[PDB]
């Protein structure tokens, strides 16, 4: 209790501190999760095995366990300084999770750690993978996600054929309970891209670096330019996520008076049919850094690839 309990006290920092080792002592925790990979050896959107973190779950009052975790990485010394530099450049965005850099003695050496505070059990890549590779005999991740965020309860999965679209078309009502989470994720993504452009940061955005609350981490593949010239690359993020925006009906709040779900619907003019300006406003609000030209009216497209893109 001077190496497992000293670590547990240093991880808490200066915040609320009712944690519990979600595992064993100061060794790592292995799990099976989905990633979007590209180096000069491997590529793909598959499920791999993670092996280099020790996770602690936070307790509430009454000692009830909540959906908030502390993930303490462990790695070399050059990555440590690089990540600290980039984080200090980006630390004021509200869409960035809170980091904590410190050093600790494991046996006879001081190993450097990075802590991430109040994360979520799953990422966005897990939700997208769960819905794009559906198998009804192996769907524990989807059910856990559905129960955690109060879409349904564990008895919903007993009225079997629960997943079918033609029998039990009530499952659409359950899927559409995940929509405002996805909309909030999109808004935070745009915030993060703006911060990156201003600071002078270059890097590609992937779905496994965003948790289900919308916050971002992992600046290990990011580089530096002069301020005002940063470049976010968002081409696999948006298009991998595209099928999930109509299944969860994410954009429903835009039919309400102030984009507020607790308000009446917008009353439109009955003789109105154009809506060209509204489409441009929506595109600018949710896809600001998608860098291919969008034509609201497809009579102005350049070939049929463009027609597909804009339709």
């Amino acid at each position: 209790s001077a190496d497992a309990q000293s670590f547990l006290n240093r991880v808490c920092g200066v915040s609320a501190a009712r944690l519990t080792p979600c595992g064993t002592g100061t060794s790592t925790d292995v799990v099976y999760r989905a990633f979007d990979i590209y180096n000069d050896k491997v590529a793909g959107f598959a499920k791999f095995l993670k092996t280099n973190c020790c996770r602690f779950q936070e307790k509430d009052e009454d000692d009830n366990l909540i959906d908030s975790y502390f993930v303490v990485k462990r790695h070399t010394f050059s990555n440590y300084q690089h990540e600290e530099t980039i984080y200090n450049l980006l630390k004021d965005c509200p869409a960035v999770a809170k980091h904590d850099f410190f050093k600790f003695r494991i046996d006879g050496d001081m190993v450097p750690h990075i802590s991430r505070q109040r994360l979520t059990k799953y990422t966005m890549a897990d939700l997208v993978y769960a819905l794009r590779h559906f198998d009804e005999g192996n769907c524990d991740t989807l059910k856990e996600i559905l129960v955690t965020y109060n879409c349904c309860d564990d008895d919903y999965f007993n009225k079997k054929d629960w997943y079918d679209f033609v029998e039990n078309p009530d499952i659409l009502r359950v899927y559409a309970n995940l929509g405002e989470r996805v909309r909030q994720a999109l808004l935070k993504t745009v915030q993060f891209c703006d911060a990156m452009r201003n600071a002078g940061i270059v890097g590609v955005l992937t779905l496994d670096n965003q948790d289900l609350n919308g916050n971002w981490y992992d600046f290990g593949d990011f580089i530096q330019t002069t301020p005002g010239s940063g470049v976010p690359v968002v081409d696999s993020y948006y298009s991998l996520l595209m099928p999930i925006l109509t299944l969860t009906r994410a954009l429903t709040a835009e039919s309400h008076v102030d984009t507020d779900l607790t308000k009446p619907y917008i009353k439109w003019d009955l003789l109105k049919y154009d809506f060209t300006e509204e489409r441009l406003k929506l595109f600018d609000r949710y896809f600001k850094y998608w860098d291919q030209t969008y034509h609201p009216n497809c009579v102005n497209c350049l070939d049929d690839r463009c027609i597909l893109h804009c339709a």
């Binding site: 819905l131 794009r132 559906f134 679209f165 033609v166 299944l247």
Partner: peptide, 10 residues
């Protein structure tokens, strides 16, 4: 899987 997410049928 493809039919589930691109056709809305099981």
């Amino acid at each position: 899987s493809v039919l589930y997410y691109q056709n809305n049928v099981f």
